[PDB]
Every structure is written in C-alpha cells, then in structure tokens.
Amino acid sequence: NLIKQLQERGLVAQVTDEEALAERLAQGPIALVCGFDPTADSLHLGHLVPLLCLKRFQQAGHKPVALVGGATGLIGDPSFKAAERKLNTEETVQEWVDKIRKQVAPFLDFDCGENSAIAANNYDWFGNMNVLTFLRDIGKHFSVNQMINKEAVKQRLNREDQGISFTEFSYNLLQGYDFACLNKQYGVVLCIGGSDQWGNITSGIDLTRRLHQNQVFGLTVPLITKADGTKFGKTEGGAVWLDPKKTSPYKFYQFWINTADADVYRFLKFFTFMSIEEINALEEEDKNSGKAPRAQYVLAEQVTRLVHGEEGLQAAKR
Amino acid sequence: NLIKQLQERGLVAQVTDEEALAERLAQGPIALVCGFDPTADSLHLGHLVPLLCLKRFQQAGHKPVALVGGATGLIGDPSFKAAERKLNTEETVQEWVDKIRKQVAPFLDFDCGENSAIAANNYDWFGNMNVLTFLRDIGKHFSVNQMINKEAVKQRLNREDQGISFTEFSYNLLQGYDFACLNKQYGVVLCIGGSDQWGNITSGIDLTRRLHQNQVFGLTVPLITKADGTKFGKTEGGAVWLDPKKTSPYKFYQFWINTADADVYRFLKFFTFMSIEEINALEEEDKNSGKAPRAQYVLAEQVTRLVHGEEGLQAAKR
Numbered sequence: 001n002l003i004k005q006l007q008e009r010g011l012v013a014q015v016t017d018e019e020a021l022a023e024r025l026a027q028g029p030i031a032l033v034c035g036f037d038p039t040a041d042s043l044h045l046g047h048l049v050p051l052l053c054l055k056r057f058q059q060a061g062h063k064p065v066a067l068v069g070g071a072t073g074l075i076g077d078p079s080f081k082a083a084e085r086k087l088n089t090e091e092t093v094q095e096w097v098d099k100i101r102k103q104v105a106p107f108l109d110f111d112c113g114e115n116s117a118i119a120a121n122n123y124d125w126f127g128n129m130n131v132l133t134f135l136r137d138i139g140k141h142f143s144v145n146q147m148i149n150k151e152a153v154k155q156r157l158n159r160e161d162q163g164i165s166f167t168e169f170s171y172n173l174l175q176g177y178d179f180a181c182l183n184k185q186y187g188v189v190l191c192i193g194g195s196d197q198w199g200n201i202t203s204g205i206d207l208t209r210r211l212h213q214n215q216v217f218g219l220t221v222p223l224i225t226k227a228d229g230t231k232f233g234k235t236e237g238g239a240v241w242l243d244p245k246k247t248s249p250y251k252f253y254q255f256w257i258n259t260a261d262a263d264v265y266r267f268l269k270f271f272t273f274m275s276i277e278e279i280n281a282l283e284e285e286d287k288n289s290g291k292a293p294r295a296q297y298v299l300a301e302q303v304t305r306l307v308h309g310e311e312g313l314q315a316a317k318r
Numbered sequence: 319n320l321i322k323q324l325q326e327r328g329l330v331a332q333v334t335d336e337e338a339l340a341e342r343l344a345q346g347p348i349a350l351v352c353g354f355d356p357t358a359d360s361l362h363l364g365h366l367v368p369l370l371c372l373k374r375f376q377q378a379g380h381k382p383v384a385l386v387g388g389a390t391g392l393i394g395d396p397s398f399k400a401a402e403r404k405l406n407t408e409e410t411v412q413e414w415v416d417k418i419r420k421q422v423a424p425f426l427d428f429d430c431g432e433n434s435a436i437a438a439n440n441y442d443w444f445g446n447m448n449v450l451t452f453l454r455d456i457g458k459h460f461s462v463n464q465m466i467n468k469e470a471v472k473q474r475l476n477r478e479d480q481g482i483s484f485t486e487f488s489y490n491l492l493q494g495y496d497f498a499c500l501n502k503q504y505g506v507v508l509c510i511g512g513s514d515q516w517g518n519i520t521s522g523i524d525l526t527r528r529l530h531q532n533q534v535f536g537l538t539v540p541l542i543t544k545a546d547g548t549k550f551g552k553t554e555g556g557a558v559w560l561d562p563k564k565t566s567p568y569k570f571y572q573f574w575i576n577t578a579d580a581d582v583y584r585f586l587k588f589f590t591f592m593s594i595e596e597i598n599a600l601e602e603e604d605k606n607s608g609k610a611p612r613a614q615y616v617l618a619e620q621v622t623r624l625v626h627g628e629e630g631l632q633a634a635k636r
C-alpha cells in the first residue's frame with residue numbers, strides 16, 4: 001500500500017522488513033520518527049526530503065514524531081563523513097536547536113487529535129544521564145567488533161591516515177537508544193531517514209529488541225542527488241537553507257526554476273504532493289509540447305509555497 | 319636510587335621514562351597512585367604486591383594514593399581478560415568498596431605527616447558526571463584506531479571466539495581520566511600497577527599531557543607468579559584472601575610455610591620488607607646448612623604479621 005506508493009516516487013532506498021512493516025501499517029495507524037541534528041541554525045534542501053516524508057506518512061493517517069538532536073548535536077554523527085567533525089558550543093547548539101524546532105513545525109499538522117505531530121528532543125533524556133548508567137545499561141548491548149564493521153564508519157577505522165574519535169564512535173548508541181526510548185514512551189515503531197542513516201537505524205531496531213523485545217522497523221529514502229551527479233542544497237553561495245533570512249524566497253524560487261530537465265520530474269516526486277500520475281502527465285505534456293517545459297514553473301511554485309506559503313510565493317515574484 | 323632498588327628485587331616490569339622518573343623522584347617527594355577495583359568483598363595476595371610497592375614508595379618518603387574503583391568496578395576492566403567480566407549490582411559493589419577501603423587502610427601510613435596516605439574513589443567524579451560531558455570532554459581525546467590495537471584488548475577483537483562490549487571498551491578512558499583527575503587535585507605524577515595495567519597507565523599519561531600539558535609517569539610491577547608455573551594466590555579453596563574470615567590467619571600462615579624452594583626467596587623480595595642483603599644471606603645460609611630452609615618460616619612470619627598483625631600471627635600458631 002503506502003510503501004509501494006513511495007516506491008513509485010522513488011523515495012525508498014531500503015526497508016528493513018518491507019512485508020511485516022507493510023502488514024503493520026495496514027493493521028492501523030502507527031507513530032514514526034525522523035531525526036535532524038543541529039549542525040547549523042537552519043535546515044536545508046536535503047533535510048526537506050525526510051521531513052516531507054513524515055508529512056506523507058501523516059496524511060496516510062500516521063503520527064509523525066519530529067526529533068531534533070539536542071544531545072546528539074553535541075557529539076556529531078560520523079556516518080559516511082570522511083573527516084572528524086568539530087564540536088560546537090553547548091550554547092550555540094541550543095540556539096540552533098530552537099531555530100529548527102520552530103522551522104520544522106509548519107511542515108506538519110500539530111493538531112488533528114489522533115495523529116497530531118510530536119516534537120521531540122533527545123537532550124530530554126541524554127541531557128542528565130550519568131555516564132556510568134549509559135555505559136552499563138546501553139553499552140553492554142553493543143559489540144565493538146561489529147560496531148567496527150558498520151558501513152557508516154568502516155572506512156574511517158581502516159586507514160593509517162584517517163581516524164575517528166571515541167566520541168563520534170559512540171554516536172551510534174545514542175541514536176540507537178533514541179529509538180528504543182521513543183518506542184517505550186510513544187509507541188514509535190518506525191524510524192525513517194536518508195540512506196546514510198541506515199546503520200544508525202539498524203542499531204536502533206536491535207537495541208529496541210533487546211531492551212523491550214518489540215519488533216520495530218526501519219525505512220530509508222535515497223539521498224537526492226542532481227542528475228549530473230554534482231551536489232545538492234549547495235550552489236555558488238552555499239546551501240539552500242529553508243530559513244528565508246538565509247535564502248530569500250525570491251532566490252529560493254529562482255533555484256527551482258533553474259532545475260535541469262533530467263531532474264525536474266524526479267524533484268516533483270520528491271518535493272511535491274502531486275499525484276505520481278499528474279507528474280507523469282506533466283512530463284508527457286512537456287515532451288510532446290513544442291513549447292518550453294512547464295515542469296520547472298510547477299516545481300518552483302509548489303516548493304516555494306510549501307516552504308514559504310503564499311506570502312513567500314508572492315515575494316518570489318517581486 | 320629508588321627505581322633501581324625496586325629492580326634489585328625484581329618488582330619493576332616497565333617504566334615510562336626511567337631516566338626522567340629517576341630524576342623527578344630525586345628532585346623531591348612525589349604523589350603517586352595505584353587503584354584497586356571492587357570485584358569481591360576482599361582483595362587477595364596478587365593485589366598485595368602493588369599495594370606493598372605503595373608502602374615502599376611511602377617509606378622512601380613519597381605520598382601514596384590508594385584508589386578504589388567505586389565507578390570502574392561498575393564498568394569492568396577488560397585488560398588481558400579472556401571473556402567479558404559480568405556486571406555487578408550498584409548495590410553489591412558499593413558494599414564491596416567499603417570493605418576494600420578499610421582492608422586497605424592498615425597497609426599504608428595515614429598520618430606520618432607530609433606523606434600521609436590518601437584514600438581515593440573515582441565514583442567521586444564519575445558517579446555524577448553527564449554522559450555527554452564525558453563523551454566530548456574526554457572521549458574527544460581517544461582514537462578508536464589506536465584503541466583497537468592496544469595490547470590489553472587486541473585480544474578480544476581480532477578474534478572470532480572472543481568479543482568485547484562497548485562498556486568494557488570504554489574502561490580505558492575512565493582509568494585514563496582518573497590519572498588526569500588525580501594529577502589536577504593532588505599533583506599525582508606516578509601511577510604504579512601490575513604488568514597488565516600498563517596500557518591503562520599509558521592512556522592516563524597521555525590524557526594528562528593532552529589535558530594539562532604535564533609530564534606524568536607510570537611504572538608497573540611484574541605479575542608475580544609461582545616459579546613452578548601454576549597461578550599465584552590460588553589453592554584448593556581458591557584465592558588466598560586478606561580477609562581473615564575468607565582465609566584464616568592459620569590457613570594464611572600455612573600457605574606461606576608451604577612455599578616452594580624456588581619461590582621462597584623471590585617471595586621474600588616481593589612480599590616483605592627485609593633488606594635485599596639479609597634476604598640474600600638467608601638464601602646463602604639455607605644453601606649450605608644441613609638444616610631445613612628457614613626462609614619459609616621467615617616469609618610466613620613476615621607476611622602473616624604484615625597482613626594480620628601480632629594477633630593474626632599468634633593465632634596461626636594454635
């Protein structure tokens with residue numbers, strides 16, 4: 001049902017147990033979660049993929065849990081990161097943390113009773129957790145041997161040149177715990193994220209099992225890349241922040257207009273709520289049209305509106 | 319001077335910088351430490367060797383710091399251990415800790431003046447420490463790459479049959495910090511322990527340099543064993559405790575008088591305070607004297623009074 005729908009949009013990289021998950025979603029609504037760490041004072045175009053995905057689940061009747069890593073942001077996810085990351089002050093992360101919560105809010109119905117959205121922060125629990133407690137209760141459930149051969153950190157370990165701190169090496173446990181913790185108190189049985197996050201989610205489904213014996217689920221969406229395999233979110237001036245202050249609505253819309261013909265269609269699937277059908281209709285319509293492609297105009301309008309409301313769209317054009 | 323004196327009786331296995339440590343010990347009295355983890359309600363003969371080196375250094379005028387791992391004993395030191403030590407309740411361990419402390423107190427002088435002994439417990443700084451505080455303020459200084467190859471745990475990894483949890487894999491950072499922490503509040507510049515405790519010491523040396531920029535040293539005593547090969551401190555009823563209740567003064571004295579001829583002399587150098595001279599005369603004497611060796615008798619008289627006092631001795635005689 002739903003999974004298959006997302007597959008049609010090409011928004012599904014890997015699924016831990018497609019069937020069981022598919023069957024579970026069927027039984028009735030569930031609660032899922034997606035996490036975002038405070039690396040900046042705003043999220044960017046990349047983050048909008050998973051985020052928009054929660055909303056997609058919500059509309060299918062599920063309850064989204066949007067979690068900001070108030071704690072993991074003090075450590076740093078080393079997942080597929082080639083080089084160690086630098087630690088940001090406790091005060092700066094806080095500030096950033098707050099800008100994100102608020103920034104994420106507008107993207108989800110936080111009131112419709114049943115499946116109203118939930119904002120969550122792991123600082124809530126890791127923030128005042130004794131180190132010994134953490135090592136004992138969670139640590140005893142992780143094997144360094146296998147922690148070592150996880151794709152998300154494998155390479156940094158095997159390299160007489162590269163390396164990784166004990167700190168970021170532990171990152172895995174905290175996100176892993178977050179799952180079990182969000183499951184214990186909210187019934188969250190699904191965690192979604194971009195491909196890179198897989199390993200982190202994996203550890204999460206495992207801890208949740210050995211701590212509460214609950215079959216939990218994981219589902220990742222591919223990391224969206226420009227067709228010409230360049231970057232994304234990044235341009236000549238930097239990341240396409242969602243924060244109007246960092247990227248004007250006018251500039252934001254101009255961005256989508258400039259999409260390549262080999263992307264615009266996929267991008268309409270990843271960023272808009274257009275019936276996979278009409279998107280194909282639009283493609284076909286554009287192909288046989290001796291006219292210019294209108295897909296970009298669509299894409300630009302839809303996203304600029306999702307991210308900035310009619311106000312921002314009105315601005316985008318003046 | 320002192321370093322070489324301890325070598326005379328083979329109580330030194332390694333030293334971080336013999337030359338410099340030698341020069342430093344000469345400059346004047348220093349603060350040194352040795353730690354003992356609560357893994358039972360009592361210590362055994364193996365623990366005595368190191369403990370005795372602390373009293374040695376003290377007689378030489380230095381300040382002994384006797385630490386008890388109220389926190390480490392909750393994590394489990396994996397050093398050269400074959401299988402994962404299991405966790406003990408917080409309840410049990412604190413109970414063992416008191417025991418070990420009080421048991422330890424008699425062996426060191428707690429009021430000779432400037433070099434009076436200090437009782438220490440790392441639960442003091444780990445019991446109330448945030449995990450995020452730990453992982454970043456300390457973790458950030460440990461390379462998983464270098465951690466994986468450290469001898470004390472190269473075993474557990476690089477093996478199919480074995481394994482190590484994230485918990486015990488973290489032990490190194492705790493003892494490493496204990497050194498730094500001790501160096502900052504007592505100016506402790508020396509950490510002595512058994513051969514197996516080396517790597518743990520090293521890591522302390524570095525963190526101390528890395529966190530305070532001070533040259534700190536480490537020296538390990540050889541792991542005393544029976545020349546015949548078999549494990550030390552073991553019997554039919556197992557380990558020989560220092561707790562009269564676990565091992566009566568009588569049984570204790572008997573264990574000593576039963577010492578093998580190839581061990582008895584070394585044992586006099588390790589477990590007693592006889593000068594290397596008289597211990598050598600004794601060996602010589604025993605050599606060409608139609609009588610039975612009296613070193614056994616001596617050794618038992620000494621160690622028995624050391625560990626149980628005049629009462630304990632007179633008791634091993636009835």
Ligand SMILES: Nc1ncnc2c1ncn2[C@@H]1O[C@H](COS(=O)(=O)NC(=O)[C@@H](N)Cc2ccc(O)cc2)[C@@H](O)[C@H]1O
Pocket residue numbers: 034035036037038039045046047049050067069072077122174175176178179192193194195196197200221222223224225232
């Ligand atoms: N270009 C992109 N396309 C698709 N997805 C993308 C993307 N760029 C980022 N993302 C995804 O959207 C999120 C972006 O935030 S993130 O900083 O990368 N998140 C992280 O690093 C996670 N460790 C955060 C986290 C997740 C769960 C927790 O319980 C705690 C923390 C991630 O799930 C990432 O996989």
Ligand SMILES: Nc1ncnc2c1ncn2[C@@H]1O[C@H](COS(=O)(=O)NC(=O)[C@@H](N)Cc2ccc(O)cc2)[C@@H](O)[C@H]1O
Pocket residue numbers: 352353354355356357363364365366367368369385387390395440492493494496497510511512513514515518539540541542543550
């Ligand atoms: N048979 C033996 N011969 C000589 N020395 C021996 C011995 N058996 C044990 N020892 C030494 O005497 C001590 C015995 O206690 S122990 O439980 O093994 N100690 C430990 O495991 C350390 N991790 C304790 C510790 C040390 C320093 C800290 O800052 C914190 C904790 C260690 O220094 C050990 O190396």
